[model samples]
Target: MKIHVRDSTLVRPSAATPAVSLWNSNVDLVVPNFHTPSVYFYRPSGADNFFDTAVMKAALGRALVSFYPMAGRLKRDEDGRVEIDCNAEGVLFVEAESDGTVDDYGDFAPSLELRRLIPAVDYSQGISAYPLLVLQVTFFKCGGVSLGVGMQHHAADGFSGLHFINTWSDMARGLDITLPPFIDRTLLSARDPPQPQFKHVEYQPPPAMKTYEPAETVVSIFKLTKDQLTTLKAKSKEDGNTTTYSSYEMLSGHVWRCTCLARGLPEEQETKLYIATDGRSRLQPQLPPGYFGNVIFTATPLAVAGDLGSKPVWYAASKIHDALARMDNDYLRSALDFLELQPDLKALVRGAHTFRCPNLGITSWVRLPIHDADFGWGRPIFMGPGGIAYEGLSFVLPSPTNDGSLSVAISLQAEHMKLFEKLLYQI
Candidate 1:
């Protein structure tokens, strides 16, 4: 396969930056695990050569030069390893898939698959320290193409990366990127880096579960309406709940109820709601503003399985609402403390109790860098984000429905989704 490449200039000669280390931890063991974090898409022939490497590279360089002044300008080997530490530049990996010609036309299906590429972690060989923002582009046998985009959660997140991509594409297509990015490290500085180590208090000392056996998980996607969201929101308000209750709260409640009914788990058992919290803001008093990505936390709520199964939809949603509402400084500190004091990291594998809760695993895929990743082929058709690392997963994407409502995608237990569909239409 014939491929071309480009490099970045913001290279640092010291050890991996704190932001980079944070990303390694974030991608490796934090949040959604290794089998997560890559977004892919296909392009027709006409669209493949939209800007070519030269045009694309030039545009990207100009944009980075202007927007993110400190954006790392980097270069990688043929196999994709960072060799120079100059600037953390994005590597534009290009390869021609054994086809006779290039399909530059954008005359194909309109879609993108938001997902993650699982990675193998090696502690013995000291391979745990690596950047998560890996990028790869594959040309298919036909005029089709696939793009692999990976980001270190701790480095630059979905929003930051996407913004960069959008700027790059614009530069490639000759568009002006008005708002240049900000990358001042000192801006992230706080009065004091929260002594007594805030992490020591907020962590959930791991190895709590005995084991994690991969079960046959299924995925399903659904769109939510503004009215539906409004109804859910109103319900929460009438119930006298405040803080952290939004569309996510309402939808999760409905889905939780639907799943519990499908699973047939007794109403007595408590369901767990795992909601993701972007620790970037919480870690505020500690890390700097240029903190980058993957500074997030997960909040798990336990609900009575039996009660949830037999309760009305609003009840289920309320449980999710309640869990998220308390995920403030106290919650974060308590969980962090538990984690920081763990004597053994193996607790993550202990016999785990299953909790049926709302689809509280919220993701910012809707705000991820999908619209901006041009690579000369124009914008991706389905540039969305998602992951498959949990027993139950829930996600939302911005949409045109309900006056810009959010579309929900969920992967319930296979039988649960089936039961849900059955009960959904029966009513």
Candidate 2:
């Protein structure tokens, strides 16, 4: 699996965009080290201009005119606060050729090989020189191509990233985009004097606590049939709990419980499950129609392994359900205030999603418009996450076939992976 980079350069906005400083509480929580990575694969278009580099580059330039933040650089203020310096320095775009064919990766499973499809950034170059957004267009010998996008999490969340991609594809198709991005970050600012109105365990007080060191692990994709999901919902009802759970809740609960069992954690050991709750709608008055940036907060629900493994699935589902119920407007605003009260903003950024044994994290992309990213080539046959070097991470996505089923991309230790599959299929 050798990859040769043919060309690389900075992609600036087609038109000059205003230089501005973006200040928001949501950016305070994300680490400067992490980037969100994704890959979209397309079969041969058979068109004369299929995936032409010039065409794609032109489309990206036009898209960045509206999404100018992606063309900016990330920098720290004198107080060590992180913000995007919208200098119009431009995004990093790389054109590469891979010796491997599309058929080499069937169904697009997670692997080290897939990482080659995405462009790599030199952190040594410093954030000031590199753009928040970087992309790679790889052409395979089979005429198929993969578009890999990597953007700093602090620059934008999943919602904002998808918006940019969809907008770029629209430009490639020669369509007009009516809704411009809403870049005002004051909407997520903390209250005056920064008084926290509620207790927030999600954002913990700092003392440099013990960190979780992960072991070597493997990644696998698991599919859940519609009938299996129905059974999970029915099981939730058996415990005399009348609350009906959504597909996200039921499936997440199942994964959390089953993962604990596979790891063989002590029955009484405490385990935690973390999920991202988008703050756009959860906040008061909601974010504007196309509000951009990292507008999300995490919800952590803890339970003893004994209870999670022995209790009915619904009982586990209820824990997540109730935790999410607490994330309304007041709770989110309180979190914003909580972030404001912290003295060391740099420390807060590095403290997110720290993985340890007996703990798991799940991100749901089931509702995002993933398959519609057709840039003049037909819709992608498959979409997948770029490998993030994190253990105990699981992603849930909608099945490409548009059936009622769902797909989960997960990573776990070898022994645990085997047991998880056994129990997952035992149902």
Candidate 3:
């Protein structure tokens, strides 16, 4: 599919924003410095104003006035620590026309072809060289448009990413930004005297590592119908209890079980599933709706391959249940203070490089307001992650149709994908 770039420029803030440096919390510093890409698709509305570039640009400019941290560059403080220099550097916006229609890209799975929809950044230029947010508007031959976004993970989390878009959409149609962003990340700063509360196992030194070299991996979306998700929960229910666990727990456990079986790991091999959760509500006096930046951390569950694979999925689901149950206010604050005490935060960056095979990191976007970003036309017909990759990661997202089904996007070692699919929905 050919894509012609029509225009590219930095969309600066509509009004001047504070030029002070925004001190990033330890949570932001711990996250890897990179842009996480996702795409949103709007079908043809048979109208002239459909995804008008002028409207989008103006709306984004207005948005930056409040979410100004995103419109800034990453710079280090005098003590040699990372922070956002809110100099209003502006975000990258590009316009392009795609030769193929949205249908040509089946499933929107994360792949090389899908990656082209978003503007690419050259990481070799170092951290501050690139904009914190890069956006592209690719119009298809069918007149539909795909909004590909590359948001810096350091300044925002998936929650913040969606919030920014929702706010931008509000401005695009001239609606009030219902919840103005709460930009003071210092609200989550480590407590005084550095209290050590929970064991903080998630931050434990990772085990011996083996990197999965650059090569092809089978990345695909597995759509589990409402019935199938119900089936999974039913299979995982403890003695058919009334309490139904979340799809994340059941599905994550099921995937972990299937991954172990598909890879055929030895009975004694230990496997861990890293489950990510938002601490916004978990903390005392829950964070405001628009609390920006990262308030997420991973809670890990472990089991030997034989036990995880042999036992009913409920065994694994309960493990997930317990892991998440440990992420209360005390644990969240302890984890924060723990990071504050660390000598060097770089060594703590968690990803495939630190936690890979014999382990998988999974996050669920099922509850996220993925469909709330409605421009003038309507809610997107298709909106989800575009592509590129990781150490066995799985993203559980709500189906675009707003149907009761869930889409589990997975990237796996090529060979394991075939068997993994079969065993995932296994009887």
Candidate 4:
């Protein structure tokens, strides 16, 4: 596909620090490349006054001119291999051939045939290794529209990408673009190379003398009212759970309990719950307001598997809180030290065996205001997330500003989901 490029600033993040250097080494981080970043927008049935193709193309001209750094390549200098510089570029492609129906899986709807179709699903997806960015606008013959965006993770963090899209939208809609201050990364560089402590988290070894089996994760969405969340926190504090288990911990505990029960695991058997922590703040203790890129960490709470089915939800939730709240410098250092000890982690990595109560996975929300990322045509009404590859991923995101609630998205096994719904409704 022919693409357009724009003039932009080129700056490098500050050198890395010892405490945060580990982040530079973890490439295939658990976050899925397929589903992590996707944004969409929509137009109602009779909004004919909406911008047409020429208008969008004109906006693209402005957008392309204004497009900055969304994707880049990391290269090493032959003369001095240690010297690294990044070269990056981005593009905006218009797709308007959808027949107004959703069909096709396992592979992208390669042909831009979704444009001419009605009932559109316009979205964007980006490739890192290819350094190619695709901006799709699905439309209906009836004058409806949706937009999707995909980008390389190495280029920018979620917030950074959202800011760029919003900037483009402002330029497209004749509004002033108030860009945030961009800072070159420097907070991560350490005074001493490989600063004395780097530990790695340990997991089960690879399967031996066994065949490989593919597994799938299912998603279920739930809405939480403000009061409900407040009540959970209030009750948790009253229970003397010093960590103050948040709403996520409560929900995760409930799900973990269901998983254990469904698997027929005893009420007191031992298990583990894992929570993902973004290390952007902790990794670079003093990173500037706009420093960007991937920075994350994970925490696991080991407990009895049997407690899931037998314990109170609050009790279970407390475990999750304890796990997360323990993410202080002591834990961070020891974790780093552990990683330094085991250099070949990827080679022996084994997939999770089953869904047990204590084997819960909790992920904080990565919502960076995608709806505001309109590039001229108004924001999309519905934005389907990209592909998912998690067995028990739990997310906690902010609700629409007007709604004043939280959006809870869970990805678990189908059978476990049914049990979750049954128990959730009952609760």
Ranking by TM-score: 3, 2, 4, 1
| Tens digit per residue, CA lDDT, model 3, 1-427 | 8999999999889998898898889888888777888998888887878899999999999999999999999989899998998889899999999889988877877665777889989889878999999999999998889999999888898899899999999899899788899988888999898997766788775433244446356787788888888878787555565556676778888888988887777787887777888999798878877999999888988788899877878788889999999889988999999999889987888766544566787878888889888878888877777774674788887987756997777887788788988987774
Q: Where does model 2 exceed 4 Å of error? A: 26-29, 205-214, 350-353
TM-score of 2: 0.94
lDDT of 4 by residue, 15-125 (tens): 221121112223222223332345353555344556455555455445433333332332333532111123323344555544443323211211223222212223343
* Candidate with best TM-score: 3
By TM-score, is 1 or 2 better?
2
The C-alpha stretches of model 1 lying farther than 4 A from their native spots are 1-35, 40-48, 51-54, 57-131, 139-145, 154-156, 175-214, 225-245, 280-291, 329-378, 400-406, 423-427
The Cα local distance difference test for each model comes to 0.47, 0.80, 0.84, 0.48
Model 2 per-residue lDDT tens digits across residues 1-427: 7889999989899998989987645544454575678998899978988888888889999999999988988887887767788888998889998888999987676655677787777778776766788899999988899999888877788888899998898888888775788887778888887777767766553222144455687888888888887777777567577778877888888888888898888887787777888888777786897887878788888888899889877777889998899989888888888877777655665333554467778889898888878899888887878874566788887887767788777888877888988777655
Instruction: Between candidates 2 and 3, name the one with more favorable lDDT.
Output: 3
Listed in order, each prediction's TM-score against the native is 0.64, 0.94, 0.94, 0.68
Model number with the top lDDT: 3
Task: Kindly provide the TM-score of model 3 when superposed on the true structure, using C-alpha atoms.
Answer: 0.94
Candidate 2 vs candidate 3, TM-score winner: 3
* Model 4 TM: 0.68
Listed per model in order, the count of residue pairs whose N, CA or C atoms clash below 3 Å is 76, 0, 1, 52
Span of ten consecutive residues with least summed lDDT in model 3? 206-215
* lDDT accuracy of residue 163 in candidate 4: 61
